[PDB]
Scaffold this motif. Structure first.
Motif, mmCIF file in Angstrom:
data_model
loop_
_atom_site.group_PDB
_atom_site.id
_atom_site.type_symbol
_atom_site.label_atom_id
_atom_site.label_comp_id
_atom_site.label_asym_id
_atom_site.label_seq_id
_atom_site.Cartn_x
_atom_site.Cartn_y
_atom_site.Cartn_z
ATOM 1 N N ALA A 169 34.541 38.321 26.688
ATOM 2 C CA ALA A 169 34.053 37.141 25.944
ATOM 3 C C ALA A 169 34.740 36.205 27.398
ATOM 4 C CB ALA A 169 35.398 36.766 25.035
ATOM 5 N N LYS A 170 35.510 36.504 28.268
ATOM 6 C CA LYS A 170 36.134 35.627 29.403
ATOM 7 C C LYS A 170 35.019 35.729 30.256
ATOM 8 C CE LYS A 170 38.532 37.607 32.515
ATOM 9 N NZ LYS A 170 39.712 38.131 33.088
ATOM 10 N N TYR A 171 33.717 36.171 30.068
ATOM 11 C CA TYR A 171 32.665 35.775 30.743
ATOM 12 C C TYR A 171 31.365 35.401 29.926
ATOM 13 C CZ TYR A 171 35.112 39.012 33.793
ATOM 14 O OH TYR A 171 36.161 39.667 34.609
ATOM 15 N N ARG A 172 31.678 34.885 28.746
ATOM 16 C CA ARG A 172 30.752 34.113 28.128
ATOM 17 C C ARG A 172 31.368 32.960 27.007
ATOM 18 N NH1 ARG A 172 31.760 36.619 23.349
ATOM 19 N NH2 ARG A 172 32.456 38.541 23.135
ATOM 20 N N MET A 173 32.287 32.433 27.639
ATOM 21 C CA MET A 173 32.909 31.325 26.934
ATOM 22 C C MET A 173 32.650 29.867 27.050
ATOM 23 S SD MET A 173 34.509 33.215 24.904
ATOM 24 C CE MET A 173 35.643 32.172 23.684
ATOM 25 N N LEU A 174 32.525 29.691 28.542
ATOM 26 C CA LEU A 174 31.989 28.301 29.005
ATOM 27 C C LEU A 174 30.661 28.403 29.494
ATOM 28 C CD1 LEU A 174 35.369 27.159 30.046
ATOM 29 C CD2 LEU A 174 34.227 26.257 28.232
ATOM 30 N N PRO A 175 30.059 27.391 29.546
ATOM 31 C CA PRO A 175 28.664 27.435 30.238
ATOM 32 C C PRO A 175 28.778 27.507 31.761
ATOM 33 C CG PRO A 175 29.359 25.192 29.867
ATOM 34 C CD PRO A 175 30.248 25.939 29.010
ATOM 35 N N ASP A 176 29.931 27.320 32.179
ATOM 36 C CA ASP A 176 30.047 27.586 33.819
ATOM 37 C C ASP A 176 29.785 28.913 34.127
ATOM 38 O OD1 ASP A 176 30.628 24.781 34.617
ATOM 39 O OD2 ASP A 176 32.387 25.017 33.393
ATOM 40 N N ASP A 177 30.040 29.912 33.121
ATOM 41 C CA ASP A 177 29.990 31.295 33.120
ATOM 42 C C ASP A 177 28.599 31.901 33.420
ATOM 43 O OD1 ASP A 177 32.839 32.191 32.577
ATOM 44 O OD2 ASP A 177 32.485 31.141 30.712
ATOM 45 N N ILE A 178 27.603 30.985 33.131
ATOM 46 C CA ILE A 178 26.183 31.427 33.267
ATOM 47 C C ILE A 178 26.137 31.955 34.695
ATOM 48 C CG2 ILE A 178 23.846 30.566 33.337
ATOM 49 C CD1 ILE A 178 24.681 30.870 30.473
ATOM 50 N N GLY A 179 26.791 31.224 35.682
ATOM 51 C CA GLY A 179 26.780 31.831 37.070
ATOM 52 C C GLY A 179 27.330 33.055 37.358
ATOM 53 N N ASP A 180 28.307 33.505 36.742
ATOM 54 C CA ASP A 180 28.905 34.869 36.755
ATOM 55 C C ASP A 180 27.938 35.929 36.694
ATOM 56 O OD1 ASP A 180 31.618 34.435 37.281
ATOM 57 O OD2 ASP A 180 31.262 33.485 35.333
#
Lengths: 46, 150, 151, 341, 150, 50
Positions: free
Chosen positions: D224-235
């Motif tokens: 989840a810690k890689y799909r909670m916030l839109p900013d994570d799209i970059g990861d």
């Protein structure tokens, strides 16, 4: 009873059952009041 | 019950039919070799091609009637619209391309894709926002299909 | 994959693997305590009471093999109401008989004469049940009030 | 007549079944946690201030009756046997009353309670289920608009009413634009782009596997810690023809929009359900009529659709079998009128 | 899938291919953003649900071949609605404690598979979910090795 | 010459089909078979009549 017994829509068995159940009980109570009741009443009453 | 049968063995056949067919139209109804109510439709004021109509009828009426009061089978004298892309040999060649490319190009720039959602099923303790993610979306107008980068 | 230096790259290194729920959308809590049950729903034309009866019948053989701690509890249920409905209505039936009996005696001094009515309706009611079944009808809430009433 | 004209009508009596329930409906975008919090308060209101009534509860988060979602959440209640409940307050009616009030006061969402209508899901009288269909090719937006205008007028001039939508809140959505161009340039395949954006944020049913005998599924998603916030799209980076990773933001693009979390369609046509109860003074029929004449004022393309009415005919049939039967043994045209009074 | 996708990717396909079913009052549709649609057809009072179901679900067979493969391999059902539960056998643990997921699985793997078949049980609801091999990926790692979910 | 059912597309709400065929003036006479050229491994077109 029987007349209104002509249920409809969703109130089908609703008014149906009640009506018929009583009407059935009727003829039954009638036959009984023409076979059982009479005989019993006659056989022994006094 | 008869229909049920004759069409549940077909289910045992389907898996062995040309994929083109499987994705095409397969039906099982109650024949009647004879129509009756033939509601023909025309236009007077705002004229519309004998195809402009066909579509309309098959997109507001036919979808209905074909379900209304046990209508065995509805016939649509014509056909509903469809995104038609008439290819041209020369052009395709004048650019070194085959229909396959046109198809593959379409089945790539025209399709909806499923994307998860901000705040995934199992979130991290403390997540306050949960929004669904929108991905690609099937085209709509003709212009859009015209701008398909081959 | 295996990087140049023959270094193997196991999934175990790129993702946390674990045996877990297939879907984390709904969580059931039975009295603040973690849990999960079976919310049964009937089928258009089910016998309800007959179903639920069997639901416990089938789910009966599972109890003998449950694991340590795994116990069952019965939230939101119907059965008790169906049974209570019967018991109550039938009760009214009895009371109706015992009452008409007195009202009979207080008019027909003859303890012998005050027996026909008491033995009249019984044969009648039973007949009704016999007739209801003859029509597929069953001991429904209505089909019962009709009895009590018709009495 | 008067005592029969002013006597209110009702199908079947709603009674205590020792089992009632309450539903929770957090706002738009609420998270599994936010909603679970509301459910707790609810669960314990019965667990602490109702011990003499409640015998057990069964709260369920994410399982609403309207549908699914972190917004909803139902809770099955179970009161102690009728006996242990003397006072008329210990009956579903009262219990559910104060209950609904309590929640309405100490809550930041929508929580209620309702006695299981012993009757039937449908048929409740003095109420209606209006349907606003989209006859023309109008869009969801236009349809939603009409709905507002309809519910508006209805409320504008209520012999009143009580109307509301079915549940289409319509929350914001995160739109991701994948520039096919840049993608086809950086050397990345669209397929891979999607399948990755998918499997990552929405997971995917891969294959099956045997678990302690039974065969179960095999999913692939992501922490989840890689799909909670839109900013994570970059990861997330995708492979490229030139054997090199690629920043998702290289061919990406984003912007929030507004979509409905629930799309309703009545008879193959986009529609919206409007649940409203007949006026407090008027009744069903009267209400519906004075409801249809309202929906009949919305923009073009927006249409609509939805004792016993048989009694007037049933008793009529009785007005025959009677007079007739009252002759098969009482022939005289006199007796047939006697009892009639 | 989002409310939009499913609505015209899994839903509309069915609805359209849904017509010509003896007896039928209406057809409502709900496309939840949860990526889950659920079309319902109410038949005239008295209609034998058995044959009715057969119909409404043998036209779906004519639709299946035109549904996202993800969906086709997913869960597709056709039952007899009842919009109301009854026997709600809740299960908990006392001694050997087990997570409110450790239980969900068990119940859905010894009980649910049964009940969902026992005495005409219209539809069994599993408050939770059965286990599954979950593989939670990690962007960095995948990249730190030059790899994609694919 | 016979077109093909590619994918679907949303049209004014309803979902309709998407076909790919070709103008008629390129599929009326057998002589037109030539007008169509196929790609080749060696990244070059090829006369259908080849």
């Amino acid at each position: 009873f029987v007349p209104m017994a002509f249920f409809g829509g969703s109130t089908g068995a609703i008014y149906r059952q009640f009506s018929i159940t009583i009407v059935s009980a009727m003829a039954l109570s009638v036959l009984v009041a023409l076979i059982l009741t009479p005989a019993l009443c006659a056989t022994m009453l006094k | 019950i008869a229909q049920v049968q004759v069409q549940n063995k077909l289910q045992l056949a389907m898996p062995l039919l040309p994929q083109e067919v499987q994705q095409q139209g397969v039906s099982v109804e109650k024949s009647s070799s004879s129509f009756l109510m033939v509601v023909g439709v025309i236009n007077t004021d705002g004229t519309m091609t004998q195809e402009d109509i066909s579509d309309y009828v098959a997109a507001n009426m036919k979808d209905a009637i074909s379900r209304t009061s046990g209508v065995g089978d509805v016939q649509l004298f014509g056909s509903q619209y469809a995104m038609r892309i008439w290819m041209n040999p020369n052009e395709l060649n004048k650019f070194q391309l085959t229909p396959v490319d046109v198809i593959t190009a379409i089945k790539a720039q025209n399709a909806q894709v499923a994307a998860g959602q901000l705040g995934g099923t199992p979130p991290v303790k403390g997540q306050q926002l949960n929004a669904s993610i929108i991905a690609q979306t099937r085209l709509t107008s003709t212009e859009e299909f015209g701008k398909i980068l081959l | 994959k295996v990087n140049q230096d023959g270094s193997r790259v196991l999934l175990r290194d790129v993702a946390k693997i674990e045996l877990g729920g297939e879907n984390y959308d709904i969580i059931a809590e039975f009295n603040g305590q973690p849990a999960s049950g079976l919310g049964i729903k009937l089928a258009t034309g089910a016998n309800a009471l007959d179903t639920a009866a069997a639901i416990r019948a089938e789910l009966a053989k599972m109890e003998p093999f449950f694991p340590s701690g795994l116990k069952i509890v019965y939230p939101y249920d119907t059965t008790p109401f169906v049974k209570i409905s019967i018991h109550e209505v039938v009760k009214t039936l009895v009371e109706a008989i015992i009452l008409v009996f007195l009202v009979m005696y207080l008019f027909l001094q003859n303890f012998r004469a005050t027996l026909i009515p008491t033995i009249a309706v019984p044969v009648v009611l039973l007949g009704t049940f016999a007739v209801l079944a003859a029509f597929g009808f069953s001991i429904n809430t209505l089909t019962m009030f009709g009895m009590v009433l018709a009495i | 007549a008067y005592l029969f004209v002013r006597l209110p009508s009702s199908f079947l009596p709603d009674e205590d079944q020792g089992v009632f329930m309450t539903m929770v409906q957090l706002p738009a975008g609420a998270t599994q946690e936010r909603t679970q919090k509301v459910l707790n308060e609810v669960t314990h209101y019965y667990l602490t201030k109702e011990k003499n009534n409640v015998e057990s509860v069964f709260a369920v988060n994410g399982f609403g009756f309207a549908g699914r979602g972190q917004n909803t959440g139902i809770a099955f209640v179970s009161l102690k046997d009728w006996a242990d409940r003397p006072g008329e307050e210990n009956k579903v009616e009262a219990i559910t009353m104060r209950a609904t009030r309590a929640f309405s006061q100490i809550k930041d969402a929508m929580v209620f309670a309702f006695n299981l209508p012993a009757i039937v899901e449908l048929g409740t009288a003095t109420g209606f289920d209006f349907e606003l269909i989209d006859q023309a090719g109008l869009g969801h937006e236009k349809l939603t608009q009409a709905r507002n205008q309809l519910l508006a007028e209805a409320a504008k001039h209520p012999m009143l009413t009580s109307v509301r939508p079915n549940g289409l809140e319509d929350t914001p959505q995160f739109k991701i634009d994948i520039d096919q161009e840049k993608a086809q340039a950086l050397g990345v395949s669209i397929n891979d782009i999607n399948t990755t954006l998918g499997a990552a944020w929405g997971g995917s049913y891969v294959n099956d596997f045997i678990d302690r005998g039974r065969v179960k599924k095999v999913y692939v998603m992501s922490e989840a810690k890689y799909r909670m916030l839109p900013d994570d799209i970059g990861d997330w980076y995708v492979r490229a023809a030139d054997g090199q990773m690629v920043p998702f933001s290289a061919f990406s693009s984003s912007r929030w929009e507004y979509g409905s979390p629930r799309l309703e369609r009545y008879n193959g046509l986009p529609s919206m359900e409007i649940l409203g109860q007949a006026a407090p003074g008027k009744s069903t029929g009267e209400a519906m009529e004075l409801m249809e004449q309202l929906a009949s004022k919305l923009p073009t393309g927006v249409g609509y659709d939805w004792s016993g009415n048989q009694a007037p005919s049933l008793y009529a049939i009785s007005l025959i079998v009677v007079f007739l039967c009252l002759a098969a043994l009482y022939e005289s045209w006199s007796i047939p009128f006697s009892v009639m009074l | 899938a989002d409310a939009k996708t499913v609505q015209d990717t899994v839903t509309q396909v069915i609805e359209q291919n849904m017509n010509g079913i003896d007896n039928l009052m209406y057809m409502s549709s709900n496309s939840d953003s949860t990526g889950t649609v659920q079309i319902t057809l109410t038949f005239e009072s008295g209609t034998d649900a058995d044959i009715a179901q057969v119909q409404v679900q043998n036209k779906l067979q004519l639709a299946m071949p035109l549904l996202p493969q993800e969906v086709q391999q997913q869960g597709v059902s056709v039952e007899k609605s009842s919009s109301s539960f009854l026997m709600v056998v809740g299960v908990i643990n006392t001694d050997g404690t087990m997570t409110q997921e450790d239980i969900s699985d068990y119940v859905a793997a010894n009980m649910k598979d049964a009940i969902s078949r026992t005495s005409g049980v219209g539809d069994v609801q599993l408050f939770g979910s059965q286990y599954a091999m979950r593989i939670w990926m990690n962007p960095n790692e995948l990249n730190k090795f030059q790899l994609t979910p694919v």
